Amino acid sequence: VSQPPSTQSTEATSGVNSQEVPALTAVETGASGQAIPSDVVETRHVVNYKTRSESCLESFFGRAACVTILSLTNSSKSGEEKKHFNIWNITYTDTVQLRRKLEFFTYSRFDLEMTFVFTENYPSTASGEVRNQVYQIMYIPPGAPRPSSWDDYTWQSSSNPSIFYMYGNAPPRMSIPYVGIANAYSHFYDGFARVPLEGENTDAGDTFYGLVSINDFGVLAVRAVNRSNPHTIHTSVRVYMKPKHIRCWCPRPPRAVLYRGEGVDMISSAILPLAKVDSITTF
Amino acid sequence: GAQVSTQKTGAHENQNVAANGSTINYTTINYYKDSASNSATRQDLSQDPSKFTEPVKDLMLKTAPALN
Amino acid sequence: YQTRIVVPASTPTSMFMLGFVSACPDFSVRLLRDTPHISQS
Amino acid sequence: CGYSDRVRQITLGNSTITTQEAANAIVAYGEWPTYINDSEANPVDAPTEPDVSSNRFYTLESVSWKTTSRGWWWKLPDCLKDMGMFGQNMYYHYLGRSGYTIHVQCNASKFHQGALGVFLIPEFVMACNTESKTSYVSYINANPGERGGEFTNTYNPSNSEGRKFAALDYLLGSGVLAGNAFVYPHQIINLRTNNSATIVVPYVNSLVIDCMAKHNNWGIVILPLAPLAFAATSSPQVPITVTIAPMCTEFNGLRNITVPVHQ
Amino acid sequence: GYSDRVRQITLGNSTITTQEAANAIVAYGEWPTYINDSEANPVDAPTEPDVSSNRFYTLESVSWKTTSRGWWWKLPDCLKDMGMFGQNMYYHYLGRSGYTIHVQCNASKFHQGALGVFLIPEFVMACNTESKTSYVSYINANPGERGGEFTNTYNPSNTDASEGRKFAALDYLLGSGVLAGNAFVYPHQIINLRTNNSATIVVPYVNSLVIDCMAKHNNWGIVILPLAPLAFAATSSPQVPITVTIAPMCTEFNGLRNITVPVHQ
Ligand SMILES: CCCCCCCCCCCCCC(=O)O
């Protein structure tokens, strides 16, 4: 049995009167200071059995997060037929907690576990007998046709992945292999999707900046598959994601301020991330 | 064709040695052929902090002055 | 201040220093929690 | 025999840089630029390797360090787009790849004080100066050339003034506190000990090779960390000169010269 | 390689660095050690603190002005309230220690002047009255971390009992009748402002006994003199601080009793 490597142990050490100076360095070098307690104080011999387990990237990332909430309305009213199904752009952008962890890195490569959770209620003041509902989650790859309606032919899912869930059973779940075209997903893209060429010179219209212009993972088309009932059912579909088997590159700091949309845009009302301290000598 | 590995030390498992008994083991069988379907990878504590904390071209020693 | 900062003639009398913080090699964490530093409506 | 970490001679192509006062040198992430290996390659076309033609240092227009400066911004493959052969090849070839040597120069007397942090940021994506639409910056403003751009300490988004970056210094232009800028490979020119900084930059992307007219894989950020000061005057000035060379330059796919929107 | 000027001294929970020292002196070539069984006087079970008393302490700073004639300290006395060293010397009848003495004084390259730092064993000083001999109060004899000062005027009083109980601390005669120019016989280092900004002297315990009573006797004193005057030429009156930092080392005590509380003001 192989014991996992522990963090640094401390050797015992005594006093020093030498020309060696572990405490003085330069950081101008790009290096962080390297001093440890045995370099500046006398120390005792302490065996360190602790490990960096929860800090591993797999552990850090390995939690499902809610990413989005979709709204489906199963209704007999003709004016609500269009709401019987809904379509969502696949992204992690919609929720702050997950994009924040992912944005610690410039690039990442991972497989993704998705779980869906369904909750339903009656939005009406008059509830009544409704038969158990069934839901369909269809994946539509980029370039694939999308349904114009809940009963459109595309729901046949002859080429598309599709999972069916009967309400009340365990939340449906599946695993998605890494699908990036690149050899890693980029969480940032300092560039444009297309190069505007001489002859078409405008400032406005350059909506091609940022990764948002080069990422299309298709959509999730979610449908109640039931016939309309006299009493309307409002269903909340929560989409969860858990990155797994993840490798990350080129770390960067986390965002200090609130996000505005899909890019790195700041909100003028919220660019002040720190609290005031009464004085430099406060403690 | 199962694989056997070692569990994270539990509450009553008083050996921080992590190599005591055959009762600290677990068995994993893969049930899918697509590797994306497998459970999380084994913990790997290999690290190389120097990559980010001291990426200096020339050798730096703690005791030597940083600038000579 | 130990002693004092000594400045020669025609030299600035207001200096700055930059403090930095980092973890040492004998360092780890035990359990995850959601960060308290960011939110959304 | 008297060799010292304080001095260095960097020679690439027909260009040599000598330094008397520097804090070693940095190789970002511990890696040097290399050519694309046979085991990791996308393009089919035989590569073009300009070698000694493009792999020389070019000097970007200098900027002045004033006591009110908040910082300076450059994008790396962009700042060299009009410089010599490197420039011409990125316009002729669809794909390209290169590493870089970034050398920042800033001399001052022993009676001056102040410090500049030099950071190299992979994918230096910046926020826009408008609240009408997100991720909305013109091609021209996002690609200033050797001129670069500057950081500010105020945010005044528009509701043409909008299609440019909201380059706040304290948030590094993207909502990220500057104190953490040190995560990125960096070096400090502390006028107390150094007059220059050197960083070796590997090609970094999610791809082996990419289109240079579209993607700036690295950016250069220079920020005062400590203000410039000199007892004799309220407005001392010190020029900062940024000198850059491509390394291991490689290109793939020859077409008609690309001519991007210009001014 | 390593320079001679750059150094790091670590003891207990404290470190002192320097980038401008003229090496370091080990008085008489000997380090502080613990008493060998073969030389022990008491038969008590000794107390040997490891990292309590053996840390550096910073004494109240003094100012160097062009008119100062020097400063002095009695060594065990200057650390009498210094944490655990202080408490142990009062709880125990006997005690012994060596010391690391580190003196600091900054100046710019435009400044000039020099400080002689001398360690004098048995630094006995003259009374300030001509009517009595070997006359000095306990309190004036033992000022604490504050130290005392040297003067260049001998103004004894054969009628004023109060002044007579203070020391006649002449600078040129080191307070005892010896020309200062011969002070160099004692272990010493010079903080010449154009060369160094600090000095370090390692001090063994030196006495006729292996161990003595600390509340009664000062094994060593510290004398700092303005061997060369301070000057800046960009002011009518330059000033730089001098700070003395001291750590006991290889400390031991015996004779545990009620805490001694000396007469004080
Ligand atoms: C039947 C439902 C199948 C759903 C398949 C969805 C495919 C999603 C691809 C992975 C998204 C990656 C997002 C990112 O990291 O930027």
DSSP strand pairing (D186-190 vs E71-74) = unpaired
Max alpha carbon distance in chain B (Å)? 60
Cβ contact C3:E104 at 8 Å = yes
Q: What share of chain E is helix, strand, coil (3-state, %, to 5)?
A: 15, 35, 50
Among the partner residues A24, A25, A52, nearest to B45 by beta-carbon distance: A52
The answer to whether the CB of D89 falls within 8 A of the CB of D246 is no
Residue with tokens 């299309």: A216
- Give me the residue label for tokens 């000022």: E143
Centroid of chain to Cα D11:
19
CA E21, chain centre distance (Å): 18
Tokens of A24: 């003085």
CB atoms within 10 A of CB B67: 18
What is the residue extent of each domain of chain B? 1-68
CA A27 to CA E262: how far, in whole Å?
50
Q: Is B47 an 8 Å CB contact of chain D?
A: no
3-state secondary structure of A35: coil
Q: What sign has the CA pseudo-torsion B13, B17, B21, B27?
A: positive
Residue E163 sits in a domain whose CATH number is 2.60.120.20
At B53 the three-state DSSP class reads helix
Nearest to B66 by CA among B49, B54, B50, B48: B54
Q: Is A37 on the interface with C (CB under 8 A)?
A: yes
3-state secondary structure A86-98: EEEECCCCCCHHH
C-alpha to C-alpha distance for D210 and A184, rounded to whole angstroms: 14
Ligand 1: does its nearest atom lie under 6 Å from the Cβ of A165?
no
Q: Which amino acid, E82?
A: M
The closest residue, in CA terms, to atom 4 on ligand 1 is A139
Chain C environment of D225 (Cβ under 8 Å): 18
Q: After which residues is chain B broken (C to N over 2.5 A)?
A: none
Residue owning the nearest CA to atom 6 of ligand 1: A139
In sequence order, the 6+-apart residues with CB closer than 8 A to the CB of D251 are: D47, D48, D49, D50, D89, D90, D92, D93, D95, D96, D97
How many whole angstroms from A179 Cα to the centroid of ligand 1?
Answer: 8
CB–CB contact E8 A41 (8 Å) = no
**DSSP 8-state code for residue A61:** H
CA distance D245 to D14: 11
Taking Cα atoms as reference points, which of D154, D157, D165 lies closest to residue D219?
Answer: D165
CB-based contact A1:B18 (threshold 8 Å)? yes
Q: Kindly state if the Cβ of A115 falls inside 6 Å of ligand 1.
A: no
Structural domain for E252, as ranges: 7-256
Residue E265 lies inside a defined structural domain of this protein: no
Size of interface A-E (CB pairs under 8 A): 49
**Exposure of D86 by Cβ count < 10 A (0-12 exposed, 13-18 middle, 19+ buried)?**
buried
List the alpha helices (DSSP H) in chain E: 75-78, 83-91, 138-141
Question: Which of A113, A174, A176 to mutate for ligand 1's pocket (most ligand atoms within 8 Å of CB)?
Answer: A176
Which tokens hold the place of E58?
């910073």
User: Is residue E10 exposed (0-12), middle (13-18) or buried (19+ Cβ within 10 Å)?
Assistant: buried
CB D114 within 8 A of CB D240: no
**CB-based contact E218:E124 (threshold 8 Å):** no
Q: Residue type at A154?
A: T
CA distance A254 to A101: 8
For residue D237, what are the contacts with CB-CB under 8 A and spacing of at least 6? D64, D65, D66, D228
Minimum-distance ligand 1 atom for the alpha carbon of A178: 10
Hey, what long-range contacts does A161-166 have (CB within 8 A, 24 or more apart)? Answer: A162/A136, A162/A137, A162/A138, A163/A136, A163/A137, A164/A134, A164/A135, A164/A136, A164/A137, A164/A225, A165/A116, A165/A118, A165/A134, A165/A135, A165/A136, A165/A137, A166/A132, A166/A133, A166/A134
Question: Tokens 């002005």 label which residue?
Answer: E65
Contact C27, A7 (CB under 8 A): yes
User: Per-residue DSSP letters for chain D?
Assistant: ----TT-EEEEETTEEEEESSB---EEGGG----PPPTTS----SPPB--TTTTSS-EEPPPEEE-TT---EEEEHHHHTTTSHHHHHHHHHEEEEEEEEEEEEE----TTEEEEEEEEEEET----BSBSSSSS---HHHH--GGG-EE-BS----B--TTSSB--BTTTTTTT--GGGGGGSSEEEEETTT-SEEEEEE---SSSSSB-TTTB--EEEEEEEEEEEEETTBSS--EEEEEEEEEEEEEEEEE-SPP-B---
The partner residues of D221 in beta bridges, in order of sequence, read D73, D119
Token pair recorded at residue E251: 């400390």
D259: in domain: no
Which residue, chain included where needed, has tokens 């309220």?
A: D234
C-alpha closest to that of D27 among D199, D171, D183, D212: D199
E3 interfaces chain B, CB cutoff of 8 Å: yes
E118 alpha-carbon distance from chain centroid: 8
Pick left, alpha or beta for residue A12 (phi over 0 → left; psi -120 to 50 → alpha; otherwise beta): beta
Cα(A75)–Cα(A84) distance, integer angstroms: 7
Indicate the DSSP class of residue A198: T
CA torsion through residues A68, A73, A78, A81, sign: positive
Q: Are the C-beta atoms of residues E98 and E246 closer than 8 Å to each other?
A: no
Rounded distance from Cα A112 to ligand 1 centre (Å) = 7
CA D16 to chain centre: 19
Helix (H) or strand (E) holding A85: strand A85-89
- The DSSP call for residue A60 is H
| N-terminal to C-terminal alpha carbon distance within chain A | 47
Is A84:A72 a contact under the CB 8 Å cutoff?
yes
How far is the C-alpha of A162 from the C-alpha of A220, rounded, in Å? 10
Is any atom of ligand 1 closer than 6 Å to the C-beta of A162? yes
Q: Is the CB of A217 under 6 A from ligand 1?
A: yes
DSSP summary character for residue E216: T
Q: Give the residue before each break in chain C, using a C-to-N cut-off of over 2.5 angstroms; say none if it is continuous.
A: none
Q: CA-to-CA distance for A117 and A83, rounded, in angstroms?
A: 19
Give, in order, the Cα–Cα distances in Å from E233 to each of E110, E149, E237: 8, 26, 9
Number of structural domains in chain E: 1
Choose the residue to mutate in A186, A217, A219 for probing ligand 1, maximizing ligand atoms within 8 Å of C-beta: A217
Q: Is C38 exposed, middle or buried (0-12, 13-18, 19+ CB in 10 A)?
A: middle
Q: How far is CA A61 from CA A105, C27, C34, E117, in A?
A: 12, 20, 12, 61
Cβ–Cβ under 8 Å, residues E114 and E228: yes
Sort strands D58-59 and D238-254 into parallel, antiparallel or unpaired.
antiparallel
Name the residue among D214, D263, D251, D259 with its Cα closest to residue D46.
D251
> Which DSSP string do the residues of A95-125 spell out, in sequence order?
-HHHHHHHTTEEEEEEEEEEEEEEEEE--SS
Pairing of strands E112-121, E188-192: antiparallel
Task: Give the gyration radius of chain D's Cα atoms.
Answer: 19
d(CA E245, CA D248): 56
CB of C16 closer than 8 Å to CB of A81: no
A214 lines ligand 1 (CB under 6 A): no
Closest ligand 1 atom to A162 CA? 1
Are D101 and D127 in contact by the 8 Å Cβ rule? The answer is: no
Residue E119, amino acid: L
Question: Is E212 strand, coil or helix?
Answer: strand
* Contact residues, chain D, for B57 at CB < 8 Å: 24-27, 200
Closest CA to E169 of E26, E24, E49, E71: E71
**Tokens of residue D212, six digits:** 């240079």
Question: Do the domain assignments include residue D63?
Answer: yes
Euclidean distance between CA atoms E209 and D211, whole angstroms: 85
Return the structure tokens found at E39. Answer: 């030389």
Cα–Cα distance between E46 and E252 in angstroms, integer?
6
Question: What is E5-50 written as a DSSP string?
Answer: S-EEEEETTEEEEESSB---EEGGG----PPPGGG----SPPB--S
State how far Cα D90 lies from the chain centre: 17
* Chain A residues with CB-CB distance to C19 below 8 A: none
Q: Beta partners for A154? A: none
> What are the Cα distances from residue A213, in Å, to A191, A193, D93, D127, E184?
9, 6, 23, 15, 80
If phi > 0 it is left, if psi is from -120 to 50 it is alpha, else beta; for residue D182 that is: alpha
Strand partners, A116: A239
Q: For chain A, positions 51-90, list CB contacts with chain B under 8 A.
A: 51-53, 56, 58-59, 62
Domain ranges of chain A: 1-283
Ligand 1 and A69: CB distance under 6 A: no
SS3 E83: helix
Helix, strand, coil percentages in chain A from 3-state DSSP, rounded to 5: 10, 30, 60
Decide: residue D262, CB within 10 A, 0-12 exposed, 13-18 middle, 19+ buried.
exposed
Q: How far, in Å, CA of D89 to CA of D85, rounded?
A: 6
> B66 and chain D: CB distance < 8 Å anywhere?
yes
How far D237 CA lies from chain C's nearest CA (Å)? 15
Under DSSP, is residue E152 helix (H, G, I), strand (E, B) or coil? coil
Q: Are D165 and D129 in contact (CB under 8 A)?
A: yes
Contact A52, A8 (CB under 8 A): no
Q: How far is CA E40 from CA D97, E70, E212, E248, in A?
A: 78, 38, 12, 20
Evaluate the CA torsion angle D161, D163, D165, D168 in order and state its sign: positive
| CA–CA dist D19, D103 (Å, integer) | 10
- Which ligand 1 atom sits nearest the alpha carbon of residue A243? 15
DSSP letters spanning A207-271: --BSGGGS----EEEEEE-SPP-SS-EEEEEEEEEEEEEEEEEEE-PPP-S---TTSSPPPTTS-
What does the alpha-carbon distance between residue D196 and residue E261 come to, in Å, rounded to a whole number?
61
Contact state of D25 with B60 under an 8 Å Cβ cutoff: no
In the reported structure, the alpha carbon of residue A263 is separated from the centroid of ligand 1 by a whole-number distance in angstroms of 19
Instruction: Output the CA A180–ligand 1 centroid distance in Å.
Output: 10
Q: Which of E57, A31, A28, A263 is nearest to D116 (CA)?
A: A28
**Do residues D91 and D258 touch, judged by C-beta distance below 8 A?**
yes
* Residues facing residue A6 across a β-bridge: none
The answer to whether the CB of A92 is under 6 A from ligand 1 is: yes
**Residue (of A30, E129, A42) closest to B54 by Cα position:** A30
Quick one: tokens of A195?
Answer: 């190069």
